[PDB]
Scaffold this active site. Structure first.
Site, PDB file in Angstrom:
ATOM      1  N   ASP A 257       0.825  -1.216   0.000  1.00 29.09           N
ATOM      2  CA  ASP A 257       0.000   0.000   0.000  1.00 29.09           C
ATOM      3  C   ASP A 257       0.862   1.270   0.000  1.00 29.09           C
ATOM      4  O   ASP A 257       0.496   2.269  -0.628  1.00 29.09           O
ATOM      5  CB  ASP A 257      -0.932   0.035   1.228  1.00 29.09           C
ATOM      6  CG  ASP A 257      -2.316  -0.620   0.998  1.00 29.09           C
ATOM      7  OD1 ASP A 257      -2.579  -1.272  -0.031  1.00 29.09           O
ATOM      8  OD2 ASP A 257      -3.174  -0.478   1.907  1.00 29.09           O
TER       9      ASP A 257
ATOM     10  N   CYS B  97      -2.497   0.769 -13.467  1.00 31.59           N
ATOM     11  CA  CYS B  97      -2.556   0.760 -12.015  1.00 31.59           C
ATOM     12  C   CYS B  97      -3.711   1.687 -11.658  1.00 31.59           C
ATOM     13  O   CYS B  97      -4.746   1.633 -12.315  1.00 31.59           O
ATOM     14  CB  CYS B  97      -1.192   1.131 -11.432  1.00 31.59           C
ATOM     15  SG  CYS B  97      -0.392   2.638 -12.181  1.00 31.59           S
ATOM     16  N   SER B  98      -3.586   2.560 -10.657  1.00 27.23           N
ATOM     17  CA  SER B  98      -4.700   3.478 -10.443  1.00 27.23           C
ATOM     18  C   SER B  98      -4.650   4.666 -11.414  1.00 27.23           C
ATOM     19  O   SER B  98      -5.620   4.916 -12.134  1.00 27.23           O
ATOM     20  CB  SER B  98      -4.742   3.953  -8.988  1.00 27.23           C
ATOM     21  OG  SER B  98      -5.989   4.627  -8.781  1.00 27.23           O
ATOM     22  N   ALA B  99      -3.523   5.383 -11.480  1.00 26.88           N
ATOM     23  CA  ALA B  99      -3.413   6.498 -12.433  1.00 26.88           C
ATOM     24  C   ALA B  99      -2.798   6.099 -13.772  1.00 26.88           C
ATOM     25  O   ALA B  99      -2.943   6.847 -14.750  1.00 26.88           O
ATOM     26  CB  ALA B  99      -2.585   7.646 -11.833  1.00 26.88           C
ATOM     27  N   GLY B 100      -2.165   4.942 -13.853  1.00 28.48           N
ATOM     28  CA  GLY B 100      -1.508   4.501 -15.077  1.00 28.48           C
ATOM     29  C   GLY B 100      -0.185   5.194 -15.400  1.00 28.48           C
ATOM     30  O   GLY B 100       0.169   5.302 -16.582  1.00 28.48           O
ATOM     31  N   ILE B 101       0.575   5.618 -14.383  1.00 26.02           N
ATOM     32  CA  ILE B 101       1.865   6.278 -14.618  1.00 26.02           C
ATOM     33  C   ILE B 101       2.971   5.796 -13.692  1.00 26.02           C
ATOM     34  O   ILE B 101       4.150   5.815 -14.068  1.00 26.02           O
ATOM     35  CB  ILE B 101       1.736   7.817 -14.540  1.00 26.02           C
ATOM     36  CG1 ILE B 101       1.260   8.315 -13.168  1.00 26.02           C
ATOM     37  CG2 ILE B 101       0.815   8.318 -15.640  1.00 26.02           C
ATOM     38  CD1 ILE B 101       1.251   9.859 -13.027  1.00 26.02           C
ATOM     39  N   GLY B 102       2.631   5.360 -12.482  1.00 25.36           N
ATOM     40  CA  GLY B 102       3.663   4.988 -11.518  1.00 25.36           C
ATOM     41  C   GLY B 102       4.151   3.544 -11.576  1.00 25.36           C
ATOM     42  O   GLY B 102       5.189   3.262 -12.189  1.00 25.36           O
ATOM     43  N   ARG B 103       3.425   2.617 -10.935  1.00 26.46           N
ATOM     44  CA  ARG B 103       3.712   1.187 -11.128  1.00 26.46           C
ATOM     45  C   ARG B 103       3.713   0.805 -12.612  1.00 26.46           C
ATOM     46  O   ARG B 103       4.547   0.003 -13.063  1.00 26.46           O
ATOM     47  CB  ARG B 103       2.682   0.333 -10.379  1.00 26.46           C
ATOM     48  CG  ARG B 103       2.687   0.579  -8.887  1.00 26.46           C
ATOM     49  CD  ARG B 103       1.560  -0.155  -8.177  1.00 26.46           C
ATOM     50  NE  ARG B 103       1.331   0.443  -6.861  1.00 26.46           N
ATOM     51  CZ  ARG B 103       0.353   0.088  -6.032  1.00 26.46           C
ATOM     52  NH1 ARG B 103      -0.505  -0.862  -6.390  1.00 26.46           N
ATOM     53  NH2 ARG B 103       0.221   0.706  -4.859  1.00 26.46           N
ATOM     54  N   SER B 104       2.769   1.343 -13.381  1.00 27.66           N
ATOM     55  CA  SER B 104       2.693   1.024 -14.813  1.00 27.66           C
ATOM     56  C   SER B 104       3.967   1.448 -15.535  1.00 27.66           C
ATOM     57  O   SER B 104       4.451   0.750 -16.447  1.00 27.66           O
ATOM     58  CB  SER B 104       1.480   1.726 -15.432  1.00 27.66           C
ATOM     59  OG  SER B 104       0.237   1.171 -14.998  1.00 27.66           O
TER      60      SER B 104
ATOM     61  N   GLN C  10       6.557   7.964 -10.464  1.00 33.41           N
ATOM     62  CA  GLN C  10       5.932   9.024  -9.660  1.00 33.41           C
ATOM     63  C   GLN C  10       6.761   9.493  -8.469  1.00 33.41           C
ATOM     64  O   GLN C  10       6.449  10.550  -7.898  1.00 33.41           O
ATOM     65  CB  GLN C  10       4.581   8.543  -9.105  1.00 33.41           C
ATOM     66  CG  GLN C  10       3.462   8.530 -10.092  1.00 33.41           C
ATOM     67  CD  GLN C  10       2.163   7.978  -9.473  1.00 33.41           C
ATOM     68  OE1 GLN C  10       2.055   6.793  -9.131  1.00 33.41           O
ATOM     69  NE2 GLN C  10       1.197   8.840  -9.316  1.00 33.41           N
TER      70      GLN C  10
END
Ligand code: AWS
Length: 282
Positions: free
Chosen positions: A181, A215-222, A262
């Protein structure tokens, strides 16, 4: 500089935040006018994460062709990816319309539906074989075929049917279920194992449309997923693998979607993943 020793030099000097801020300063800025039209407000999860006009995925619809999704096309590596936000209640039908129209084989999900006590994306696939989903706005049907639950990730086989033409296709859902998390994983080993499972499925290969990753925003983990994959492929292709510059690759990817990676912790984790992954390849 090489990667592994540039890495230890940033650790010893504690300068990850300064390196990451340099990337943020040098990153491309292109217009995102379609994303900001008033009619699209309920199609965006976050007001500060938008696709650039030049690289956005268009839905094949004349009313409204907008989805928060970008085509990342890596020319030297010969890989393409679609990076998108986690679907919203009013965009689950658009999401599967995109998968269909772009001829994708695989969907890569790097978040849980609920994290930190809040909803990070809609429950957009069926959880039981006998309870299929119908998306009436885009005329698609989605059925769970099988599910294989492992300790760090789950793989699902799904059937997507275009109800207009009665054509069907098999879609593979690769769900990484153990990203913490807060922060990043301590070891990249399970993330790399997951990447290799996606590769082995054919979902990243040129005989299919681009993989859809979110992912949630599509920029960090993605961003971490596609950056690691592309860097490892370039290390296999080139005569001199130590010439691969992860900061330069990231800036190239940021020509196609804003904000990829991010935090400075995500940047360090991406280095770690590429470094460890390069040893296993050989
Ligand atoms: C790229 C493309 C191919 C295609 O077959 O059709 C399109 C339509 C309309 N048809 C009925 C889906 C569009 O509105 C927008 C784009 C396309």
């Amino acid at each position: 500089m090489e990667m592994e020793k540039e890495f230890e030099q940033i650790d010893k000097s504690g300068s990850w935040a300064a390196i990451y801020q340099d990337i943020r300063h040098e990153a491309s800025d292109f217009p995102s006018r379609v994303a900001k039209l008033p009619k699209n407000k309920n199609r965006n999860r976050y007001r500060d994460v938008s696709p650039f006009d030049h690289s956005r995925i268009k839905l094949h619809q004349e009313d409204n062709d907008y989805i928060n999704a970008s085509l990342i096309k890596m020319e030297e590596a010969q890989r393409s990816y679609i990076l998108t936000q986690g679907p919203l209640p009013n965009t689950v039908g658009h999401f599967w319309e995109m998968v269909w129209e772009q001829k994708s084989r695989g969907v890569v999900m790097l978040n849980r539906v609920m994290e930190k006590g809040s909803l990070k994306c809609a429950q957009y696939w069926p959880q039981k074989e006998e309870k299929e989903m119908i998306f009436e706005d885009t005329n698609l049907k989605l059925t769970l075929i099988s599910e294989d639950i492992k300790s760090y990730y789950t793989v699902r086989q799904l059937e997507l049917e275009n109800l207009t033409t009665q054509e069907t296709r098999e879609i593979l859902h690769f769900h990484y279920t153990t990203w913490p998390d807060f922060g990043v994983p301590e070891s990249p080993a399970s993330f790399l194992n997951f990447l290799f499972k996606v590769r082995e499925s054919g979902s990243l290969s040129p005989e299919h449309g681009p993989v859809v990753v979110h992912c949630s925003a599509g920029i960090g983990r993605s961003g971490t997923f596609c950056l690691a994959d592309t860097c490892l492929l370039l290390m296999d292709k080139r005569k001199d693998p130590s010439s691969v510059d992860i900061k330069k690759v990231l800036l190239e990817m940021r020509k196609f979607r804003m904000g990829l990676i991010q935090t400075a912790d995500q940047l360090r984790f991406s280095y770690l993943a590429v470094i460890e992954g390069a040893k296993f390849i050989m």
